[PDB]
Amino acid sequence: PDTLLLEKHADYIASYGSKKDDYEYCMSEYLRMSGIYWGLTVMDLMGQLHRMNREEILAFIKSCQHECGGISASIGHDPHLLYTLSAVQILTLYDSINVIDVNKVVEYVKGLQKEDGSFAGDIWGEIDTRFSFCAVATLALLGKLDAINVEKAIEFVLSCMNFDGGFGCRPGSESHAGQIYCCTGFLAITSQLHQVNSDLLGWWLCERQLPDVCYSWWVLASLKIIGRLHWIDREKLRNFILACQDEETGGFADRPGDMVDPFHTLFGIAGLSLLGEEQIKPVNPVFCMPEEVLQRVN
C-alpha cells in the first residue's frame, strides 16, 4: 500500500547474497564491484550498513587493485575506471581509503586523460564522458583533483553539449540522460555549473521519458544538481516508486510487477531521499552517497 516501511527492504539486501545461484552472479562478476557499492550505499542510507560484512569487502577491494593502480570489478578482472570509482566510493563509506594505494589510483586516473582533456575507460582508450565523470569523482573523494588538467577536462565535456542542451558520450553524439547525469555531475565537482543552461536542460529532462530506473535516477539526480528539481511532481512520483516495490520479497524493480534487483532498489530508496523522504538519509545526487559521509574530521 502507501506504507514506506524499510525494515523488510534492508532484510532483502542482506539476504540477497545468501541465495545459492552459483552461476547467476558468475555472469555479473564484471559488475560486482559496483554491485557491492550499490547494495552498500542504501544500507547506509537506511542506517543498516552494519548488516553487511565490511571486513570481507575491504579485503576484496585491496585484492582488486592492480600494479598500475587501477581497480578491477572483481579479483582476476582487468582494471577499469568505472570500478575504480565504485571501489573508492565504498572505501569512503567505511572511512578507510588508505586500504588501497591512494597515490597509484591517482596516478592511474591521471594517466587516462588525453590531450583534448577527455578521459579513457582503460588502457585501450575508449572515449566517453562517463569516464570524464568517473575520473573527476574518484579524484574528488581522494582529494587529489588538481592532479589532472581540469581546464582541458572541462573543455572537452562542454564540447559534448548538444543543441538540445543535453550531453553525449563523445562530441557529436546524441543527448542522453545517462551522459547528462555524468556531465552535470562533472560540472558540479569542477565548479562549472554556470556553463550549462539550467532552464533549457531542465525543460529537456522533465519532457524526456523512457533498465528504466537508470533513466529515472539520472533525470532526478541531474535536476537536483541543476537546481530546477521542482519542475516535476514530487508526490505523484513518490507513490509510483512505492508501486515498484515488492511486498513479498522487497526491493525495487524497473516497473511495478517486474523482477527486483539491488541496483534499481537503490534509486527507489535514493530517489525518495531526493524527493524529500524523512525516514531515509539525505542522499547526494552527484556521488549517490549519504550526505553525512561526505563530511570528515581528519
Partner 1 sequence: AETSEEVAVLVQRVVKDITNAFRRNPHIDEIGLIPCPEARYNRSPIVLVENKLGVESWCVKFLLPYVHNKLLLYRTRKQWLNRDELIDVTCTLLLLNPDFTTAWNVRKELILSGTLNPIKDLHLGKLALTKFPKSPETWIHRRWVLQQLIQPTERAQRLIQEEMEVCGEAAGRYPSNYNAWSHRIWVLQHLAKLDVKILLDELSSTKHWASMHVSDHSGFHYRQFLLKSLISQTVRINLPHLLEEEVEFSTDLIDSYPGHETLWCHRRHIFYLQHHLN
Q: Which positions make up the binding site for Zn(2+)?
A: 212, 214, 264
Matching residue, cell 542522453: 176
CB of 97 to partner 1, least distance (A): 24
* Backbone φ and ψ of 71, nearest 5°: -125, 135
Binding mask 265-294 for Mg ion (x = CB under 5 A): ----------------------------x-
Distance separating alpha carbons of residues 37 and 290, to the nearest angstrom: 12
Comparison of 129 and 184: residue with beta carbon closer to partner 1 = 129
Give binding residues for geranylgeranyl diphosphate as ranges: 176-178, 215-218
Read off the C-alpha cell for 172.
557529436
Please select the residue that binds partner 1; options are 26, 56, 194, 235, rule is CB under 8 A.
26
Phi-psi region at 288: left, alpha or beta (left = phi > 0; alpha = psi -120 to 50): left
Nearest to 266 by CA among 45, 56, 79, 109: 45
Binding mask 174-213 toward partner 1 (x if CB under 8 A, else -) reads x-x-------------------------------------
Q: Which is nearer to partner 1, 125 or 143 (CB)?
A: 125
Binder of partner 1 out of 73, 93, 196, 244 (CB under 8 A)? 73
For position 213 contacting Mg ion by CB under 5 A, the verdict is no
Residue 189 CA to chain centroid, in angstroms? Answer: 14
Burial of 44 (0-12, 13-18, 19+ CB in 10 A): buried
User: Closer to Mg ion at the Cβ: 134 or 293?
Assistant: 293
Residue of 19, 124, 239, 247 interacting with partner 1 (CB under 8 A): 124
182 binds Mg ion (CB under 5 A): no
**Interface pick for partner 1 out of 1, 19, 23, 296 (rule CB under 8 A):** 23
